[PDB]
Amino acid sequence: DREDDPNFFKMVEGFFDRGASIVEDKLVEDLKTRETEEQKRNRVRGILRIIKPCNHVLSLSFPIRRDDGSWEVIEGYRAQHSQHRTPCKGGIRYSTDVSVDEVKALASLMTYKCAVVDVPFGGAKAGVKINPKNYTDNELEKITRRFTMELAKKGFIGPGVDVPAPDMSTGEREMSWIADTYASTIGHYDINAHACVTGKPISQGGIHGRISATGRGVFH
Amino acid sequence: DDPNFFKMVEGFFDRGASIVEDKLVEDLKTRETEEQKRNRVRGILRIIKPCNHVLSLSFPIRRDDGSWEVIEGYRAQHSQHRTPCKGGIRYSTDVSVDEVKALASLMTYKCAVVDVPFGGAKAGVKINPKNYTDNELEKITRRFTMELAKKGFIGPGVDVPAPDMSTGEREMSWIADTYASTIGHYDINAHACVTGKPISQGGIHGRISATGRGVFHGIENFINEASYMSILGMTPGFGDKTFAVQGFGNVGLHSMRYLHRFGAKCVAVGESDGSIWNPDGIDPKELEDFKLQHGTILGFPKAKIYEGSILEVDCDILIPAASEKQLTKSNAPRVKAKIIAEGANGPTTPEADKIFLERNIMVIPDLYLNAGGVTVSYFEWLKNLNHVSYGRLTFKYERDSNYHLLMSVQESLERKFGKHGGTIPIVPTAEFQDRISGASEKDIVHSGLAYTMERSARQIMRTAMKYNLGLDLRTAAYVNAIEKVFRVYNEAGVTF
Amino acid sequence: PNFFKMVEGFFDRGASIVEDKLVEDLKTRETEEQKRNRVRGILRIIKPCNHVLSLSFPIRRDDGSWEVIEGYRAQHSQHRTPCKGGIRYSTDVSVDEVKALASLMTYKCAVVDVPFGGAKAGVKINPKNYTDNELEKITRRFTMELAKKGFIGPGVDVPAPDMSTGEREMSWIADTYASTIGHYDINAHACVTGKPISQGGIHGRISATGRGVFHGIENFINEASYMSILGMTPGFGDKTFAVQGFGNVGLHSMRYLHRFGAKCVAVGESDGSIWNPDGIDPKELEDFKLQHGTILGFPKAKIYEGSILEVDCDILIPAASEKQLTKSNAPRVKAKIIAEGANGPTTPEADKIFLERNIMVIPDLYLNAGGVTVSYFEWLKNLNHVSYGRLTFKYERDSNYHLLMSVQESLERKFGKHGGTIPIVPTAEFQDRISGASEKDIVHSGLAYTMERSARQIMRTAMKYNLGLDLRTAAYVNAIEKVFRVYNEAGVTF
Amino acid sequence: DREDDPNFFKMVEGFFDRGASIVEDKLVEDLKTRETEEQKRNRVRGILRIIKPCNHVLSLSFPIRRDDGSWEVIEGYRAQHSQHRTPCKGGIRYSTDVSVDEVKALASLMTYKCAVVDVPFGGAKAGVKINPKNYTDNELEKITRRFTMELAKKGFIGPGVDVPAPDMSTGEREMSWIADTYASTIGHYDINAHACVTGKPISQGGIHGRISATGRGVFHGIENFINEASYMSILGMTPGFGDKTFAVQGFGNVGLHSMRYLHRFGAKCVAVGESDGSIWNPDGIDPKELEDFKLQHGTILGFPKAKIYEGSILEVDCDILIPAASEKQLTKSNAPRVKAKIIAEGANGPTTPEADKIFLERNIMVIPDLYLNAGGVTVSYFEWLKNLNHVSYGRLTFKYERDSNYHLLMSVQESLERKFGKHGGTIPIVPTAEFQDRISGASEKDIVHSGLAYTMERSARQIMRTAMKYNLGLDLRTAAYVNAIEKVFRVYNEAGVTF
Ligand SMILES: Nc1ncnc2c1ncn2[C@@H]1O[C@H](COP(=O)(O)OP(=O)(O)O)[C@@H](O)[C@H]1O
Ligand SMILES: Nc1ncnc2c1ncn2[C@@H]1O[C@H](COP(=O)(O)OP(=O)(O)O)[C@@H](O)[C@H]1O
Ligand SMILES: Nc1ncnc2c1ncn2[C@@H]1O[C@H](COP(=O)(O)OP(=O)(O)O)[C@@H](O)[C@H]1O
Ligand SMILES: Nc1ncnc2c1ncn2[C@@H]1O[C@H](COP(=O)(O)OP(=O)(O)O)[C@@H](O)[C@H]1O
Ligand SMILES: CC(C)C[C@H](N)C(=O)O
Ligand SMILES: CC(C)C[C@H](N)C(=O)O
Ligand SMILES: CC(C)C[C@H](N)C(=O)O
Ligand SMILES: [K+]
Ligand SMILES: [K+]
Ligand SMILES: [K+]
Ligand SMILES: [K+]
């Protein structure tokens, strides 16, 4: 789909570059500080250069044991575009078409998407390079739980660090397994352990009105 | 030739994994069918091959002139079968994800052959240190440490970085100080988060000489073995042995100094810009003093200027202590040396390795020979966990026991023979007296390295005989490492 | 002069001496004025206490009434963590006293290469006015208040006992920490030193300061270079000494010097003095003081009217009280060596007179660091979670036996069937060492190695800066040089 | 200023001693326990002995590298008076006049200030011994960041341990640097890391209504007593702000807002005083006109619609005198000349205890600083809560409330239209212009204002009830300290003391 298209990653980068050059001159004159005019230009342009790229990108290679007994090494990625607002927020895609560039572009898009709706999260996006159609519900549980463990140990999941969500390829049951693994292992001593992931079922701490949310947003 | 060093390490693993595979299946005693055993072994080897984690960073820095700069950085953790991970930090504009991944994987197997309980890791900050002030380099080092710490890529029990040819002990000190005062403030072992630190910050004595001593002990273990030496048409020991060193750096200088100390004669010393040669012999102390006063070995009074590389010098031992991929298939059939002691990572290409095997030229691999520095970095990590220097509470105790031992021999002999021709004074030799007076931590670190190199040489020799590899010591070393990493995975199991 | 002003003056003197040598030894990309600012700037950071905590905690007396207790704890430096320093229970404790002793501990640890920053606590109470139950409550509550503010922890700050504090207080500090906030710490019991053996204490703690005083004197007395300057022969043979203050330090120092040939001529105390030029036996004097409470009335010694400080001897050891040797009695001291076995027994004005009179004063900074050295070993023992030698005593014994058996089997081959059997067995002294092998032997040797190494460092510093018999200045310069090096190579965060 | 004055430290100690001896006898008889009457006296006096002193005081000496390269060692202090409520709360002062005694006295005062407005924090106060005028913005950032690190490591900063705030000497940019240092270093793993400090900018998690907070508190404090007919008849005055004249001494942030809100409710500003000069007009002074002149010229001197008053505003013939300047201005020498009937302390310690005696003799009601100057403390509690909540106030309920209001109006409209039939036409029930503005402009500040109003209303009644209980009359300061000591005592008595 369009979210996996290289042309869309360049598209988002261009949108940022356009907006940064427009806002630049107004940000310098609005700055009231004890600095020279060249020190103000460096401060504004320096902050814009920090914002543009992804701050962190984690690449994973974790094991899985198939229902038939065979072993498989799974590739995964998670980019955290910005931490100006913590936790980071962003979905998890299960597709063979996921890439580092895709995960970086969608993480950056998330940062600006959150800022326009005053949602206090930095941008993030994960991608597990597998085709869910090739796996059993048991195998998908193993992949989800082990991916959660690898993200948790490296600070890429936690209620105050990074809160993943579903997308077109993941569902509420995968989100439920992510929360369950975190609450029962790394986040056992955390009172807000179930806030490490959103898109959860109602029985697991999900909000009512999640299914209609995007449609109501389009309407409003 | 010029193959990517990343592809080289991958090929070494693939070769070793297929050799060890059949022996790992029959050695497995479990309630499984023979096809279930093949899948379990091949499956664990598929897990070991790739890097488990790779972190890419983009952190800000404010230059001394006030301008801002975004720095790129990477750190790969190849394996966590042994925690913490261990691996250097390179400050170069030529660092890449593939370079950092290949060196991380190489470090896993290098640690495994010398029984150092760490997984492999490697970091790279994409900057040229020559372009930055000491203040700017401090900011880069401190900020990089912060970004690694928050994502679990630095910590005494998680990942312990180290210096490289581009970084030093002052950068290591800033890493330790940033960790100990910010994220690891509450950790009693916060200074064990990084090795290669100065002595004032918790560094081990004997770090500077470590790689050179490891190169010496590695050669020493094979040169004293008469079984291997008779194959190469040589006599055992360093007596009547001539050697040549490619690259006169920290490793080159120390390797030359220790071999010369044991009777070997240095015939030629090569460098990035020019070469030096004297068949009568080159004194390492005289060459060191000239190199420190002039900068280059070119113009040494007791040596003629050699036109060309030192790899094709008529000697017994060739030591490439610098540069990568210097011995290729084009210059391998011209090596007059009989032992090629790899003092650097990846100095010989796999195509040159084939030629050296055909020519019965024993190549002691980098995986084993270049692991002296890794071994004492393990000892530094332990020193910080111990919170005491080695020997601090036992040097005087040992000294008193030694006096009592000699006094017991003296008093026992004086009772057996009497004072017929007087007292029989049993006193320490001049050499033993120097050892007692100069007893310091460095003696224990040197001993620990020597024991590790001796033990690991015999392990590689036994693996070579077990799999009938002969002079293919590199394959023996990778099979030895894969056998050890596999055993940890097989007996621990995989979570979920 | 005040002791708090004294330690400040010692630092200022040492900092100005070491300053010029620190600039030229600095190899960095800076101008000569940038190097002077960096050195002077770092020296300014070291001098004051980094942190000082003042407490006001509640206590309920055994009768039911409530009492608010005052307490303080200063952490002079964190260039080495944890901080280390004792706890004093006295109504005379003050912020300035706690700050001066914390700074003194920084330099004292540095001269003996003990990797701790300086620290000192004081609870403003008179322990004589409280029951053992009330003292337990004060100790536990004080520990809790220190713990919540980062003033106790195995890797943060490790307290120790004082003259007003004992091993039972340390035991309550460790138990309170390990059972409440430090519960999840595997090294919780390493939060305090001076603990009983049953709670994780080292063997050789009681004798530690006395052994340190002995080894400190021993290292200088056996140096012929220094002894010829004082017009004396090297070694303890034909050496006479006098001890002022017959406490734990006084008793042990007297016992160890006597053991090595030195003769005790006089022993002084808070109430009265004892003198016998023929000699005073330390075991006989110890038994009399334990059975009568005081040394006054010792049968083998005449009652000396006055302080022991002016007795005609070779070595004077003030092993108790502060500022006993002052500018008024310094020109009357007959001893050639003054071994400070207590903190600040000689004023800086007396130091000037001793230098003029060629009387070597071994400073408290070095000589009184035996207890600090074994407190480091106790902290290490708790981190190790094992007594010293536990896994190697038997191994070492068997290696010794193999060595002697090898000499025997080799000599029996050389002298064959004529020299019969040649039994190579350990001496009586070596056999006793093997049989009595315990942790105390390793602590004693570890302390002897520290005192030997540190004496040579102070001697080398004295020669480097041409200080001669000014060993106190050599010790402070040695300590400032070490603390500076840690700051210079680590850098300052932000 | 008077918060640096040693006489003010003795004042706060004396206020506590007075309140503790008044509350003592009532605390003994109210105690129902298995103890003798002398055991009850020892328990009450013993707990009050624990409450009086500061529990912890940290003295710091931290390094700083100046922009020229030189090094400087900075002195700093932080006192935590009581932890009967955690976290501790209190500002940070950057002044060369800060001292341990100043930091201890202001820490104790914050314990009792929080207690009267039911803000669940213990008292605390920090002081860095530097003159900010001598440092660059870069140097001040280094000082702020390093000071935060030293406090964090010793438990003197943290969301659940100690939450600092700005002072007159420090601003929102300092607080932002504190929160940023904490969230990036020691508090990195804390989800509430940004709740470690209050007074932060809006972009960093600061509440809307922080700037107006102290002024609204001064207004609501006066409003609660001015509307009470019992107190007003004693002062020979009518209840309400109608026909009420007031004078403000100090045209700062508190002075400007207090003048604006009283004028909005009908009161007439007769005179405004300042550090350099005074302004007076018996016909009235418009706060918006005076604010615009002060912003364009730097001073109120020369205001066209007001004559230049020679002297302090304290003796102007008005009804309400609002000392909004942090100075011991009302002393025993000028207290017998105050023509106002109500003295509203919009600053800490503006009246001396000797002047308090004269005001009681003259039947002049002084609303104390302990209560009236607690508006900013109240919204700092709301800022701390906002950061814990991780959401602005009303974000999920403004639209919900708006829909319910429209349903209530459409119900009245349909109900009436049904009763009078279609013959009586349509009866449109729509919101007033004022209600329509409230609905359209619904934002967080509307809820912060309401929470502050509820707190000031509730606390005024508590002080009034305490005053009647102990027969204090117009001695509202003693009522406020007795109210605060009563609350702190209750926490210690019911929690107990560990060990
Ligand atoms: N993702 C974000 N990145 C940056 N600024 C943000 C982000 N989300 C919100 N903000 C801004 O931060 C401030 C938060 O203030 P607050 O009034 O508490 O928030 P809001 O009213 O938006 O809930 C507002 O200025 C808001 O626009
Ligand atoms: N990096 C490593 N990876 C895997 N196995 C290792 C590694 N280092 C050491 N080992 C193995 O783990 C075991 C550790 O046992 P131990 O006897 O305690 O170690 P050692 O004698 O090597 O110090 C040995 O079999 C050793 O060869
Ligand atoms: N308290 C201290 N402060 C500063 N430096 C110290 C301190 N204690 C020891 N050092 C120094 O730190 C270094 C520690 O190195 P190491 O050889 O491990 O120590 P040591 O041999 O003294 O046990 C030595 O240079 C030592 O002199
Ligand atoms: N700083 C404080 N110190 C002591 N008691 C306090 C403090 N703040 C509030 N209290 C008291 O603690 C109780 C808290 O009960 P609650 O009803 O939750 O509080 P509130 O209604 O005041 O928000 C009340 O009795 C309140 O007066
Ligand atoms: C060898 C072990 C550390 C392996 C670990 N259980 C894993 O799943 O990677
Ligand atoms: C020597 C180091 C512990 C110094 C530390 N970085 C500081 O700023 O105090
Ligand atoms: C009110 C409580 C928090 C008091 C606390 N239990 C103490 O011992 O001081
Ligand atoms: K970014
Ligand atoms: K792996
Ligand atoms: K200091
Ligand atoms: K209190």
Residue numbers in the entry:
A (entry chain E): 62 to 281
B (entry chain A): 65 to 560
C (entry chain C): 67 to 560
D (entry chain F): 62 to 560
What do the study authors state?
Nevertheless, with an exception of the family of large 180 kDa GDH, most of the NAD- or NADP-specific GDH are homologous to mammalian GDH. Mammalian GDH is one of the first allosteric enzymes discovered; its allosteric inhibition by GTP and activation by ADP have been known for more than half-a-century, but the structures of respective complexes have been characterized only recently.
For the first time, we report a mammalian GDH structure in a ternary complex with the activators leucine and ADP, co-crystallized with potassium ion, resolved to 2.45 Å. Remarkably, while the side chains of D241E and R207B occupy the same position in the absence and presence of leucine, the conformational change induced by leucine binding essentially involves the C-terminal segment of GDH (the residues 558–560). The ensuing conformation of the aromatic side chain of F560D, which moves ~ 4 Å down upon the leucine binding, involves F560D in stacking interactions with the equivalent F560A of the subunit A of the opposite GDH trimer. The K+ binding site is located at the end of the α-helix which ends with P114 and is formed by the main chain carbonyl atoms of I111, I112, P114 and H142 and the carboxamide oxygen of N116. As a result, the newly identified binding of K+ may stabilize the open conformation of the enzyme in the ternary GDH·ADP·Leu complex, transducing signals between the ADP and leucine sites.
